[PDB]
Amino acid sequence: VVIGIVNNTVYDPLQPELDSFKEELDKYFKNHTSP
Amino acid sequence: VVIGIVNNTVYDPLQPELDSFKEELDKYFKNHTSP
Amino acid sequence: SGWTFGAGPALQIPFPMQMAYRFNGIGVTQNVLYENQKLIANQFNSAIG
Ligand SMILES: *[C@@H]1O[C@H](CO)[C@@H](O[C@@H]2O[C@H](CO)[C@@H](O)[C@H](O)[C@H]2NC(C)=O)[C@H](O)[C@H]1NC(C)=O
Ligand SMILES: *[C@@H]1O[C@H](CO)[C@@H](O[C@@H]2O[C@H](CO)[C@@H](O)[C@H](O)[C@H]2NC(C)=O)[C@H](O)[C@H]1NC(C)=O
């Protein structure tokens, strides 16, 4: 609807500061059944 | 202390982006506690 | 009605709630009036006497 709007990404902050800890959370959850 | 207060629930915006994570966090322990 | 009657159409609004919208333009938040309604009522009632 609005004219002049441009296409760009927005670095939403809450996910990657979580994903800095979700990466080791995802590593720990899936590798628990590995051995 | 306040008069005229009305009982209601408030939709917490800090929940659902991590409740969706909590939807998949508890899913990540379904496989963890399966064997 | 508050201040609206001086702009356009007059909208009704409860007076114990107009005041919490008149603290907010000073610098003190509105979570002070409700917590002190009775004392401010007596201070206003005694001041006009
Ligand atoms: C911003 O991106 C969207 C999609 O990434 C663009 O929308 C597309 O526009 C083309 C132009 O013909 C269409 O053919 C596509 O079907 C559209 N896709 C979608 C999903 O809507 C949009 O044009 C981009 N805006 C700008 C200013 O580049
Ligand atoms: C607002 O909700 C709270 C809690 O849901 C109510 O507090 C209790 O309500 C039950 C049900 O009426 C009473 O039996 C209890 O005695 C209440 N607790 C206390 C400490 O009084 C509260 O009554 C509700 N208020 C309104 C106006 O509905």
Short mmCIF file of N, CA, C and O in Angstrom, two decimals, chain A residues 22-23 25-35, chain B residues 28 31-32:
data_model
loop_
_atom_site.label_atom_id
_atom_site.label_comp_id
_atom_site.label_asym_id
_atom_site.label_seq_id
_atom_site.Cartn_x
_atom_site.Cartn_y
_atom_site.Cartn_z
N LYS A 22 21.42 -21.42 21.15
CA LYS A 22 20.68 -22.53 20.55
C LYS A 22 21.57 -23.42 19.70
O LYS A 22 21.22 -24.58 19.48
N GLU A 23 22.70 -22.90 19.20
CA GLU A 23 23.61 -23.71 18.41
C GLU A 23 24.22 -24.83 19.24
O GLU A 23 24.26 -25.99 18.81
N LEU A 25 22.82 -25.73 22.02
CA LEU A 25 21.65 -26.49 22.45
C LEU A 25 21.26 -27.51 21.39
O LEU A 25 20.94 -28.66 21.72
N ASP A 26 21.28 -27.11 20.11
CA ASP A 26 20.97 -28.05 19.03
C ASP A 26 22.04 -29.13 18.92
O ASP A 26 21.74 -30.28 18.58
N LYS A 27 23.30 -28.77 19.18
CA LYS A 27 24.37 -29.75 19.17
C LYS A 27 24.22 -30.76 20.30
O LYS A 27 24.46 -31.95 20.11
N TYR A 28 23.81 -30.29 21.48
CA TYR A 28 23.72 -31.18 22.64
C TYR A 28 22.49 -32.08 22.60
O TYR A 28 22.55 -33.21 23.09
N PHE A 29 21.38 -31.60 22.03
CA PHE A 29 20.16 -32.39 22.02
C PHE A 29 20.25 -33.57 21.06
O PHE A 29 19.88 -34.70 21.40
N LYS A 30 20.75 -33.32 19.84
CA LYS A 30 20.78 -34.36 18.82
C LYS A 30 21.90 -35.37 19.04
O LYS A 30 21.74 -36.54 18.69
N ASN A 31 23.02 -34.94 19.60
CA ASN A 31 24.17 -35.82 19.80
C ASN A 31 24.05 -36.67 21.07
O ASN A 31 24.94 -37.48 21.33
N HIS A 32 22.99 -36.48 21.85
CA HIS A 32 22.81 -37.27 23.07
C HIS A 32 22.52 -38.73 22.74
O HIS A 32 22.95 -39.64 23.46
N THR A 33 21.77 -38.98 21.67
CA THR A 33 21.46 -40.33 21.23
C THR A 33 22.49 -40.89 20.25
O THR A 33 22.34 -42.04 19.81
N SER A 34 23.51 -40.10 19.89
CA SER A 34 24.55 -40.60 18.99
C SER A 34 25.38 -41.74 19.59
O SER A 34 25.59 -42.74 18.87
N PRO A 35 25.87 -41.69 20.85
CA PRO A 35 26.66 -42.87 21.19
C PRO A 35 25.83 -43.98 21.81
O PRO A 35 26.07 -44.35 22.96
N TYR B 28 12.18 -31.46 21.42
CA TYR B 28 13.56 -31.93 21.43
C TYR B 28 13.88 -32.83 22.62
O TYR B 28 14.92 -33.49 22.61
N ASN B 31 12.40 -36.92 21.91
CA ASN B 31 13.39 -37.86 21.41
C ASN B 31 14.50 -38.12 22.42
O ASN B 31 15.10 -39.20 22.42
N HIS B 32 14.80 -37.13 23.27
CA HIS B 32 15.85 -37.30 24.27
C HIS B 32 15.46 -38.32 25.33
O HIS B 32 16.29 -39.13 25.75
#
